[PDB]
């Protein structure tokens, strides 16, 4: 039986599993009034990926495909391939192509092309996940660009940079988009998570994304960092119980700072009340202690 | 009871470039006798020691943070960047590294997006280029210069740079095997990771190759790394003791259950194969590298 | 007509040192054959061109502003330097270092102060070792040392210079310039060294005795020209008719001249005197421009 | 007849005339509910110093004198004050207090330093409480407070001002003159108070934000004219042809005029503005004299 382990990583050595950016802080909040069903960064403790989660850190909210013709007022239609470059099969039991953004808003980035004659071009672009032509489950999506310099029918890649909404309220990180437009409803979704113990809230790995304009704070929370996605997938260690007891330890000090539950479906809960950051020392790290049952009472923070 | 050395089980489509935040596109071998191979990113020993400017975060390779200002003296607008380490400290040049971790390790222009968020929460982001051959590219001294087409940048504001691809006009301006001058022309490069080369007849370096995006021109954007970023992270975590200077590795197809080729994974973090000429090494989509055994340096690899 | 050259009418007790924010204490002459006098603050041409790290504000000499981050005065702090603007200093300007940067080897003693966005404040004594390997002002940073640990990181910090803070006198070398870029590169864009170009002449200095936080340091600091002359020449920019302006120290009570001196175009004075000696002046006397002369003019001794 | 001129100075090239710090901004405000009578930085346009105003930028809120013992900043010390030039202070002089005495109520935070005949030196943080009953500089003495007990009695002592040192913001009152003679008598020989005298006009202030040793004090200090103007007018002594000089802030980058103001004979400015508000100026702009004018001039609103 292979033991369960966490990688030894510092707050500044973790990457967001819903975006190609580093983790900036730890955060907690009540979550009764939101649905926490993100589809990227979703993995079980025994290394089973769920939702649209994949392994490549740079490919979260990115895409590959072929461009066609349809202030960012130039509209382009993207026929989506898999991030392999292999053709995307909508019949596959997944909500959308792996790496598809799992929130409502506009993903700001750069679309680039390389033609057979070796000519190239790349310009800023936005992916509106709220538009009726955001149908990646059907195999296509729409980008908008400020530039007209794009050649139709050429292979196109998208590099995510941050959020590109105009008003803060258009970015809702806890509202899944319609992966099929309004043709049909979302399917094959990774389960939604919630704390299930009195006085416990979710613990989030928080990033602040770049913003192309407006006053969007670009706050994106993920349940588990991308390195844990990659680590559990490699290890595939059998989950002994539903809950893993984890502790944040300071190697400078020897002291433990707080304890937490790491649940089998891939999320963390702590004993705290209110929307608040969790300030941690620069050398601290999460450490696996043992398998424990859901009725464990954590020391409050 | 000696902790065994391992490679993560990753297919070709599951690896990331360690010199740029992009997926690996192919495997490639090439003669390098006439060139010096000394990249500074993606440099790790098999027992988990990072070298050069290598760090763990995949997105921070060729990215930077700091404070933007207008420079003292078609991408026209010039901006000066006082460089911060990732934690938000200013970069202290007294540290024994060639440059801030993740600083580009090639000659050319890095094309990306510079973004700002002001204390009153106003934001902006526009395309930008980092010329690593500019005389004001002195990251070791704590500064660099970006070029932009837009003028919408507030000075004295925190600024991030996300790298997307090459930005040179003429393909020959991108020299992936030519180091930049980390201190400009004021002093020489320091604390470099050592250069690598095959030390056996009939052997060539094996590269993990990516085709970076390009903002224009005919640049193929070819970037070779010695080792994927996932092996950098894995070896750092494992730190398994290196039994010898060479680890024998085999590329196995798990459906066939048969090895396609074998290679030497050297202790300093680079691979060699028994092959002559510049050529891609095509592999099945489910194949992956596997550690076979520690060997002596004079082990003879099967050809190809 | 041609705009005439003038000196401000100022008494000895109405002049400020141009290398430190203190009043001028006395006049002094000294043989300088075996040293290189090349100070960077208080460097101005007679026709109003500033040189070195010289600027106009008297309080900003050996002061600085920036952001403090962490790194018996035993607490070390990293200072990311800003211009008086608030924006980081650009190392690409053709100056030796940020304007006002100290131009001597030793420790500057002062007070570092902070004011945070929530309006909370703190201030404590600090020292600036201009010989430290981490004194890299030209690169945009330096290292302060404090006895108090009460300093918030990532907060705007000012430094008010008070005086010397060396332990033994020999650490203070007023005529030894620091390495503005640490040991990464050598000093550049320096104002030229100065020396008398005539037999029997010595440099004339405006001398101040800086406060000292401890030890036996005399705190002696000599500037070539007071800060008021820096500000005056910059405003007037009168054309220099020759390389030497004859200048006379006059007593307005008695109407008599006490001595004469050469005010050179590069911005320094020489007198016909031998040996290390103070120059005693009446409390109401002052320098006054007499005429432009040729370099081979012979000053009356003393 | 010598014409009246202003020095060509930028916002960032001006010093506060009530404290040895640079000017940070321009400000305006209604002043009906305060007495604007501040004694430092008081000069007439024809070059006459008033109040406790002197020439040296570093000596505002500073003192020289002899220290002796008397009775957290625990240690109390008595200062027998000399003049800033080391000359004995005469309380019969027709001035409010020794030149450079603070002209506000609060605590001046700085460093007291000593150098002894045997060349031993000390320097530590110190505060001058101008509201204390033993703050009697007109009588020739004040009291400092220190946290360090390392001071030698009967030794020459200097004081370098750094900023404010009150605990609560309300202790610092920049528009309340201290009692230069304690409560033994009232203030004498004061520079006159100023106020706008035209409809829609308010005073224009040169504003700095002083460092603070603690608490949440904003350390905001307003002066009527910058110290460089005090020095320039003293040098020029140009005849004031009328009571009001018309002055315009011009942008050399664009050649355009941004606002105009009245510069009054007693040394203060008024603008056509309403409400407490900063006056934002471009970095290269400067004040330019236009002509002499009468008090009934109507300024263009801002």
Author numbering:
A (entry chain A): 224 to 293, 308 to 538
B (entry chain C): 223 to 295, 308 to 538
C (entry chain D): 223 to 293, 308 to 538
D (entry chain B): 224 to 294, 308 to 538
Task: Pull text from the paper.
NoVs recognize specific glycan ligands as host attachment factors or receptors for infection. NoVs interact with HBGAs or other glycans through their capsid protrusions that are built by the dimeric protruding (P) domain of NoV capsid protein (VP1). Genogroup II (GII) noroviruses consist of human noroviruses (huNoVs) that generally bind histo-blood group antigens (HBGAs) as host factors and three porcine norovirus (porNoV) genotypes (GII.11/18/19) that form a genetic lineage lacking HBGA-binding ability. In this study, we solved the P protein crystal structures of a GII.11 porNoV (VA34) that was isolated from pig caecum contents in 1997 in Japan and a close-related GII.3 huNoV (TV24) that was isolated in 1977 in the USA, representing one of the earliest huNoV isolates, focusing on their HBSs compared with the previously known ones.
The crystal structure of the native GII.3 huNoV TV24 P protein was solved to 2.6 Å resolution, revealing P protein homodimers in the crystallographic asymmetric unit. All P protein residues were modelled in the electron density map, except for 13 amino acids from 295 to 307 in the B-loop (see below), due to the disorder of this highly flexible long loop. The TV24 P dimer exhibits a typical NoV P dimer global structure. Interestingly, VA34 and TV24 P proteins share the longest B-loop compared with other GII NoVs, leading to the observed disorders in the crystallography and thus the unknown conformation of 13 and 12 residues of this loop. The two P proteins also share the small T-loop with an α-helix extruding out of the flat surface (Figure 6(C–F), Figure S3). The TV24 P protein bound secretor positive types O, A, and B human saliva samples weakly with optical density (OD) readings up to ∼0.4. All three P protein mutants with a single-residue mutation at the HBS wiped out the HBGA binding capability to all type O, A, B, and non-secretor saliva samples completely or nearly completely, indicating the requirements of the three amino acids individually for the structural and functional integrity of the TV24 HBS.
